[PDB]
Amino acid sequence: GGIAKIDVHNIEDIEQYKKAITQKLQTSLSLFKYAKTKNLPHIKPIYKYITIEGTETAEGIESAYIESEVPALAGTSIGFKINSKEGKHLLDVIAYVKSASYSSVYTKLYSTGPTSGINTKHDELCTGPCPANINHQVGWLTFARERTSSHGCEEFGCLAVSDGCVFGSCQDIIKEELSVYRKETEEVTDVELCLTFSDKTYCTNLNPVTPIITDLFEVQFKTVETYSLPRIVAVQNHEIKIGQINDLGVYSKGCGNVQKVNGTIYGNGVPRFDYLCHLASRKEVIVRKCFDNDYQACKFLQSPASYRLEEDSGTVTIIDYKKILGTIKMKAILGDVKYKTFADSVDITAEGSCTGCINCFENIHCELTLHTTIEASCPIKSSCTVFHDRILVTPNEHKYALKMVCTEKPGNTLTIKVCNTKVEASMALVDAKPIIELAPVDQTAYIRE
Amino acid sequence: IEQYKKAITQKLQTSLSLFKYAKTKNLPHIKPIYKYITIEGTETAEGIESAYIESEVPALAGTSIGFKINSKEGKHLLDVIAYVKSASYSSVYTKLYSTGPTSGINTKHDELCTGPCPANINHQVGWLTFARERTSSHGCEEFGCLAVSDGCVFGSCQDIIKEELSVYRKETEEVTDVELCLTFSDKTYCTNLNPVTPIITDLFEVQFKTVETYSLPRIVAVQNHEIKIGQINDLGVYSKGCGNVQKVNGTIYGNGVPRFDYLCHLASRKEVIVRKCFDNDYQACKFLQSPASYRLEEDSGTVTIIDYKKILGTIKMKAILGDVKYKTFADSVDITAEGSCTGCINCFENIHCELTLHTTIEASCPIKSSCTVFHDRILVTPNEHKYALKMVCTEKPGNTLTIKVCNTKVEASMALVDAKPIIELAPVDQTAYIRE
Amino acid sequence: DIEQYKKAITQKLQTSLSLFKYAKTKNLPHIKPIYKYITIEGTETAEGIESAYIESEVPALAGTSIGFKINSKEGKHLLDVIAYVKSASYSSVYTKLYSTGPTSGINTKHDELCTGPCPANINHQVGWLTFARERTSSHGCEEFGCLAVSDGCVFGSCQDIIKEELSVYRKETEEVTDVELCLTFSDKTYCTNLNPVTPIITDLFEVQFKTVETYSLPRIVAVQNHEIKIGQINDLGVYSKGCGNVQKVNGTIYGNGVPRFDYLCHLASRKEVIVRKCFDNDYQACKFLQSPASYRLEEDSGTVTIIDYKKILGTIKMKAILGDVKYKTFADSVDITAEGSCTGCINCFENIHCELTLHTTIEASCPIKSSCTVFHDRILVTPNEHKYALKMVCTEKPGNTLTIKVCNTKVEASMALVDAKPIIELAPVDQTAYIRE
Ligand SMILES: *[C@@H]1O[C@H](CO[C@@H]2O[C@@H](C)[C@@H](O)[C@@H](O)[C@@H]2O)[C@@H](O[C@@H]2O[C@H](CO)[C@@H](O)[C@H](O)[C@H]2NC(C)=O)[C@H](O)[C@H]1NC(C)=O
Numbered sequence A: 001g002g003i004a005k006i007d008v009h010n011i012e013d014i015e016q017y018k019k020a021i022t023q024k025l026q027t028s029l030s031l032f033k034y035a036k037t038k039n040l041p042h043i044k045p046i047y048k049y050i051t052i053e054g055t056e057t058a059e060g061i062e063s064a065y066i067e068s069e070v071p072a073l074a075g076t077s078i079g080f081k082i083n084s085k086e087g088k089h090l091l092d093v094i095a096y097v098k099s100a101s102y103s104s105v106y107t108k109l110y111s112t113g114p115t116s117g118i119n120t121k122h123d124e125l126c127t128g129p130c131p132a133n134i135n136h137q138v139g140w141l142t143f144a145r146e147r148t149s150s151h152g153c154e155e156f157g158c159l160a161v162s163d164g165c166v167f168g169s170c171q172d173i174i175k176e177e178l179s180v181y182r183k184e185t186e187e188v189t190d191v192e193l194c195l196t197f198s199d200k201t202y203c204t205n206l207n208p209v210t211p212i213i214t215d216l217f218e219v220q221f222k223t224v225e226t227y228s229l230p231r232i233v234a235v236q237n238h239e240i241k242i243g244q245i246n247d248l249g250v251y252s253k254g255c256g257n258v259q260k261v262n263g264t265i266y267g268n269g270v271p272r273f274d275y276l277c278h279l280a281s282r283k284e285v286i287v288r289k290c291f292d293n294d295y296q297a298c299k300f301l302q303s304p305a306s307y308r309l310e311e312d313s314g315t316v317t318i319i320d321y322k323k324i325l326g327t328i329k330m331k332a333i334l335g336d337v338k339y340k341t342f343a344d345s346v347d348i349t350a351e352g353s354c355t356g357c358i359n360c361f362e363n364i365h366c367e368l369t370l371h372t373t374i375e376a377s378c379p380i381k382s383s384c385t386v387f388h389d390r391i392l393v394t395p396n397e398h399k400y401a402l403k404m405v406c407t408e409k410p411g412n413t414l415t416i417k418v419c420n421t422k423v424e425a426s427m428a429l430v431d432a433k434p435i436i437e438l439a440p441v442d443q444t445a446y447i448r449e
Numbered sequence B: 001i002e003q004y005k006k007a008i009t010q011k012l013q014t015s016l017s018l019f020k021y022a023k024t025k026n027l028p029h030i031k032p033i034y035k036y037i038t039i040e041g042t043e044t045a046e047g048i049e050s051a052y053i054e055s056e057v058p059a060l061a062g063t064s065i066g067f068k069i070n071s072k073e074g075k076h077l078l079d080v081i082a083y084v085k086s087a088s089y090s091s092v093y094t095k096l097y098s099t100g101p102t103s104g105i106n107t108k109h110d111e112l113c114t115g116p117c118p119a120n121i122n123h124q125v126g127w128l129t130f131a132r133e134r135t136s137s138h139g140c141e142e143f144g145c146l147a148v149s150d151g152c153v154f155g156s157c158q159d160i161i162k163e164e165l166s167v168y169r170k171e172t173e174e175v176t177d178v179e180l181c182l183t184f185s186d187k188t189y190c191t192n193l194n195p196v197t198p199i200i201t202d203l204f205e206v207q208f209k210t211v212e213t214y215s216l217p218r219i220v221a222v223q224n225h226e227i228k229i230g231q232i233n234d235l236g237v238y239s240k241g242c243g244n245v246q247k248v249n250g251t252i253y254g255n256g257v258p259r260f261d262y263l264c265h266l267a268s269r270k271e272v273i274v275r276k277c278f279d280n281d282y283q284a285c286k287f288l289q290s291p292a293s294y295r296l297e298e299d300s301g302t303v304t305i306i307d308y309k310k311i312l313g314t315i316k317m318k319a320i321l322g323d324v325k326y327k328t329f330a331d332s333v334d335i336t337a338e339g340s341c342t343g344c345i346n347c348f349e350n351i352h353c354e355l356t357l358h359t360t361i362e363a364s365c366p367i368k369s370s371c372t373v374f375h376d377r378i379l380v381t382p383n384e385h386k387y388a389l390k391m392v393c394t395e396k397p398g399n400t401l402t403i404k405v406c407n408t409k410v411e412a413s414m415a416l417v418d419a420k421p422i423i424e425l426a427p428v429d430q431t432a433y434i435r436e
Numbered sequence C: 001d002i003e004q005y006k007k008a009i010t011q012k013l014q015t016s017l018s019l020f021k022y023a024k025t026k027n028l029p030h031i032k033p034i035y036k037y038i039t040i041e042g043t044e045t046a047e048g049i050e051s052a053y054i055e056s057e058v059p060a061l062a063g064t065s066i067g068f069k070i071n072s073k074e075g076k077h078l079l080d081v082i083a084y085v086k087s088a089s090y091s092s093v094y095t096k097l098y099s100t101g102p103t104s105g106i107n108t109k110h111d112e113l114c115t116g117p118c119p120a121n122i123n124h125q126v127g128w129l130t131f132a133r134e135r136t137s138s139h140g141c142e143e144f145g146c147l148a149v150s151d152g153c154v155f156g157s158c159q160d161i162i163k164e165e166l167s168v169y170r171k172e173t174e175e176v177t178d179v180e181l182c183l184t185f186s187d188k189t190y191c192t193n194l195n196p197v198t199p200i201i202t203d204l205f206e207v208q209f210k211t212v213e214t215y216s217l218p219r220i221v222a223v224q225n226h227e228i229k230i231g232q233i234n235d236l237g238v239y240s241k242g243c244g245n246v247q248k249v250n251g252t253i254y255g256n257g258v259p260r261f262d263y264l265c266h267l268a269s270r271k272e273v274i275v276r277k278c279f280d281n282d283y284q285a286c287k288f289l290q291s292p293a294s295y296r297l298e299e300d301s302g303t304v305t306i307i308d309y310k311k312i313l314g315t316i317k318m319k320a321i322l323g324d325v326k327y328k329t330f331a332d333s334v335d336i337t338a339e340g341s342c343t344g345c346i347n348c349f350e351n352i353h354c355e356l357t358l359h360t361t362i363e364a365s366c367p368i369k370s371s372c373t374v375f376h377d378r379i380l381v382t383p384n385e386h387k388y389a390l391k392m393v394c395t396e397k398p399g400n401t402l403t404i405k406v407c408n409t410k411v412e413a414s415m416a417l418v419d420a421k422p423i424i425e426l427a428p429v430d431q432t433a434y435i436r437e
């Protein structure tokens, strides 16, 4: 705690005084956990928050503190003006939250997909019952029928009736169009906070356990640790699909009931099996289906917008960046000074085009063009129920998407409000898209052998 | 005092009115039961000095705090009560399908004297196919058919169900509605709150603190205007359980292996015996849980679900009025109560209790029991005198079952009844008997 | 004099806490604050007496503590008070649904008809499955006295016989929060439970527990050999293929499936029945359930309470107003000695397991850091237990050294890559048994 002990209470010059306090805070944050990074000019506070001020006196030094709390949300920022005893001005410090997210890493369970073919092995017996245990390869299914040999249905030289057997095993052949990962690690929070003053920026990570206490500035991250990252996730063509998705070795009818793990494809079901008769020749086997394969249901999975993927070989990290993770508590005790918080006004221009349906699976989709001069975290409101409550507008990217469920019937005008800018979006109702492949597959292929 | 008390009452009144707050009738029966941690101080703006009190309160319906505002070395000037009117989170869901028990089966079948079964059986959408080879045999013919161990019988089936339940899917992310109110001189002003933007007036400031994680189930059943949750199939998912027969738009969809066999005639066409088509586990829908902490809003095709009972964060307040001194207050709560409890042990339904609770003021009451009560607290209001709550007693209770509502300690009358019989747990082998 | 005064204030706070709900317990020597937190100080005036308060906020996490040193204006020191969070957990109680396990046998009842079709309704016991074959009487396939051809029936019922090797319970009560806080001064400790609703306001000391009420306790849980396994586990009466699709509820076993059923023909005897499978029983899948590390069980007859102790449940706000004094918060430095041994694989289900020997002089809640992704973000070291476990997912291939950081102690862990364990019993059972009768 050595850098707080230097007292810059009074200097004759005000430029030298602001340079002295800027350096004092600079080495205060630099000496401790903060790292120097490239300053972002476009981040300015949009909002003002509740503040408590005071003064603590240690030995010969008097120091004034301001204490304020901020939602732990990416893009949120607050401004502080530091003045000396009704003199003006010393320094401006902006505190944004650069990163707020929680993540988990997943392990690959299996690959799945539709069934393109069936492999079959079969044998018949003229006499005797079916084998008590039918020989089959791992993950193949067995099928057997007693009493196969009958008059006019014999093989060569076979005279028995209501006797004999026809048995075999089968396995589906599939094409991999999807991979399924399982949530292995618990969910961890990455919060990155930064300070910008005198065209310089210093950043740090934050911890729920350990507060960051510098001499001149203190942050403490408060939260409750309850996060829902879905336990089992499908990935398809680099998209993230969630829903009712089978865990490893779980064959329940639904997405992923045929699992290819390591070398071999596993599945379950009752094979559709029957034979044809010849007089003097061997019986023909008819296999219409082997595994039950409900891969079609995978098309009906939800695709969440609030997550993002990082694919590493065999393992997939999933990140939630968009949500409020708690409260950031700050106490800025810079010396003998007076504090006045600021925030600027936000200017946004916008346009929008919305299309969709009602009482349907897809509901309504909106494409917004949002131009903002400064980065702003904007709560968005609508007459209908919008999926995500807010939207973070940045001067770099101008194209933003958002979806809606209208409990009522919308017209051409669709009112949506981003911060203070109230935007009328042009909407066109399209008929609900037709439902295809909802029904299961009776017959994966027709195998006659 | 009257001149100035009206000065602060009107001054704060238009200070709050300038912002989004709406004027509502003041309720005398809302009074604080608890006092919380406060930090006081004084901020100075130019020549005027203003004293602030800062206090934090749980974001829970029924929670309230009292403040008395005084003039320095004099008392008292004014009472302001802060009350949390609404704390809830909601989401809207889209209708996936209808389901229910299987009342009948539609079947179409065709027979062939000669040849194998068709390689592809033609069937209607969502129907299942069934086929048997080698149908024509001695004594098992149609007229003019003389073949043996040859021919075919093939067909299609679809269950016919009665719609007795509907299933919805969570479409929107989960959002929080919190509404707080202020009462002074028999006038009340209320407002909604936002996790992002604080509502800061000149004289009064509130900030809503939270983390954005909520337990709304992704898929919900609605049955006869109630909301039932459990293991319920998503759209197009046929796993055995509740909702494995889905009626979407016009046609009923299902999956399974039809129970199919034939009967023989000598000179006539063969009769088909269909005992089952779809796997229909609708009976399992009877075992869904019915959560008490939710409430429904039904719109055609879409259902909003609301959770009102839980603590969603903290409300932080800064009251900066002027040259005044602050002293927080809360009243004492008077509640009289009785209870009647019945139930079983190690059983699905456990114990249910009806309590008669009379309270003079609206109170958020933590409730305590030897047994484990489902919901940790209960909100008593002067309006309703009869309240219900359920329990799981791990051991066997006697006649006395002790329950404590706020500070009122209540003896509940308990009577053990045997567990309700378990019925229709087994699946249906045979949905119907179709012979034609 | 300072002695009489520190004893006077120790007694005053002591009777403040005794006057309120706090209970006296055995002082813990090993509890000292490791971290220093943000404090706001001030003075409130009640009538003629002026009192100075310190206010500080703390995460509601088991093992967390903060220190306060109380001085007299211009003099030091009077007394030390440590605020320790003894318990932070949330719990729910569950009711037993069913027992399950692999299929050891099959019970079968069957009857035969020489003439007529199969019965429109087949008689069967509760929870048994029915099976029927038309056209049973055919050439060469008879019982004595049967005249017919392409006619008759064979019907029956079956039930699996299992060995109970697992139990499944359903969450009946909502999740409730247990937080226990303590204060230590002059070798005396006072503890209390906390409530999100009602603050605890004493004369000299005030606490308020802040939280949001959202907790992830799994709705359905398996218990096996007094361990708690979670995953995709069927709710009561739900027969979907997976763990628990054969449920033994009360007296009788219930299940679902299509029985694999056929007969053999004899000339001189009655026909023999072949049942290869009755219920679909996917109990093998139960082997693949995850076993969560952050829970612990309490078993009562027929009901299971499940507790999560390891997570952050909110913030503890404290206001210590002791009168005219000066406050200065402390925390000590943490000394930990450690060794570690890690073995495991990559791109595999089991990933990496690490056993650490962690010796600490005081109880510490340690954030742990690693190059790889460790399962649990932190670990709580206490002087009693020296062996602590933690697992990892390494996206890359580790060497011999695997560095992991417990508080400020930096640990070199010996790593050995072993091949992934072979996957066994992933495929389902076609045939639960071979029954010929
Ligand atoms: C993953 O599979 C490989 C081999 O691939 C399989 O090989 C056959 C057994 C068959 O199932 C094919 O369809 C697959 O492609 C395993 O590697 C070796 O397998 C042989 C089999 O005889 C075994 O003797 C070796 O010990 C295995 N190699 C080692 C280093 O042990 C591998 O074990 C499988 N992995 C897992 C995790 O099961």
Ligand SMILES: *[C@@H]1O[C@H](CO[C@@H]2O[C@@H](C)[C@@H](O)[C@@H](O)[C@@H]2O)[C@@H](O[C@@H]2O[C@H](CO)[C@@H](O)[C@H](O)[C@H]2NC(C)=O)[C@H](O)[C@H]1NC(C)=O
Pocket (backbone or CB within 6 Å): A431, A432, A433, A434, A435, B125, B249, B250, B251
């Ligand atoms: C919902 O279904 C309707 C029609 O109902 C079905 O129509 C047949 C296909 C048959 O399956 C009936 O038993 C059902 O009741 C769809 O509306 C139109 O239906 C006509 C029928 O001739 C068809 O030609 C059109 O293509 C259909 N669509 C439109 C836009 O006219 C409707 O499309 C279905 N809804 C969805 C979302 O797919």
Ligand SMILES: *[C@@H]1O[C@H](CO[C@@H]2O[C@@H](C)[C@@H](O)[C@@H](O)[C@@H]2O)[C@@H](O[C@@H]2O[C@H](CO)[C@@H](O)[C@H](O)[C@H]2NC(C)=O)[C@H](O)[C@H]1NC(C)=O
Pocket (backbone or CB within 6 Å): B418, B419, B420, B421, B422, C250, C251, C252
């Ligand atoms: C749980 O089952 C018991 C009986 O156990 C079974 O009883 C047989 C029907 C058979 O299935 C056995 O294998 C089991 O052991 C029920 O207790 C009573 O059982 C008697 C049998 O004579 C019956 O007459 C009563 O109606 C049953 N009930 C009572 C209250 O006496 C018990 O009811 C079952 N519990 C539930 C919740 O259904």
